[PDB]
């Protein structure tokens, strides 16, 4: 009977920005995947993406607990026989932090078409800068 | 070898996408008036004028 459903005509999407300085990778990634997926709105519907547009900055300043700087290897296979490649969270927090952050958050979103389209709401930047000034980025903080 | 499974009539029509044949590449004869095939001699009336 009666139960609300959001439409393409009904949904509005806000932008947010959040420093990763002093943050843990997973402890930030969870609270940000929630915003991307859009389940802090009251008008959450599963089939359309009521999420938001998140900006992450200072991705070179995230932290790792314990001996993950040298442990915690990222593996990836090239589909050629013997084409497996390896990296470490140390050699990626300084070499490409804005893919460290991307992978951490995008493993937390469901692996479907709506999830693929919700992952690209995330805009990750090392350093304290971003080209998204024309969006009125609202300042969010975690919890 | 033998087909393990019959071809669905959607896959048949997908494979037959490019089986179309092309136009003949024809022009209007400046003497016959009727149509000729470019770089060929007018079957209808006379010469080639080239």
């Amino acid at each position: 009977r009666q139960t609300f459903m959001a439409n393409e005509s009904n949904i509005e999407r806000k932008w947010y920005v959040i420093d990763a300085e002093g943050q843990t990778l997973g402890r930030l990634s969870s609270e940000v995947a929630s915003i991307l997926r859009g389940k802090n709105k009251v008008t959450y519907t599963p089939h359309v993406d009521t999420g938001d547009y998140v900006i992450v900055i200072n991705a070179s300043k995230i932290e790792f607990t314990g001996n993950k700087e040298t442990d915690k290897v990222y593996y990836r296979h090239s589909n050629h026989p013997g084409g497996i490649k390896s990296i470490t969270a140390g050699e990626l927090r300084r070499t490409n932090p804005e893919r460290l952050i991307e992978n951490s958050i995008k493993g937390m979103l469901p692996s479907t078409r709506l999830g693929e389209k919700q992952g690209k709401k995330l805009f990750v930047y090392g350093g304290a800068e971003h080209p998204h000034a024309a969006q009125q980025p609202e300042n969010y903080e975690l919890r | 070898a033998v087909p393990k499974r019959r071809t669905s009539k959607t896959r048949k029509n997908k494979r037959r996408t490019h089986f179309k044949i092309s136009v003949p590449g024809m022009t209007e004869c400046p003497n016959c008036g009727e149509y000729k095939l470019s770089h060929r001699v007018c079957k209808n009336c006379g010469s080639y004028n080239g």
Binding site: - | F19, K20, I21, V23, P24, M26, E34, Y35, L37, K43
Partner: protein
Amino acid sequence: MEAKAVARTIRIAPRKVRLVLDLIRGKNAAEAIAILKLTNKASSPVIEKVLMSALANAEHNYDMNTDELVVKEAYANEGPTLKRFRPRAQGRASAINKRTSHITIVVSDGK
């Protein structure tokens, strides 16, 4: 109105004829004679016949201008097939289908 001509039980497999018919479908009928007259294929003469008959049904027995005529609807349907045999080796026998077709062309004046 809409004039049509038909050639029933022509001795060509219909999906060889549909090739040629996918060229003249929708053309100014002054072109379609020449198109069918210039192409390699073999189903072209026995379609030139049907087209010229459907155009000679426009001037005669109706009254239309055969310059104003586009080939509105051409197509080809299956007729009765002639099932024959071909001896393969070792006592085997393989069936043959000498298929036919019905070639239908409908020319109009757009009125």
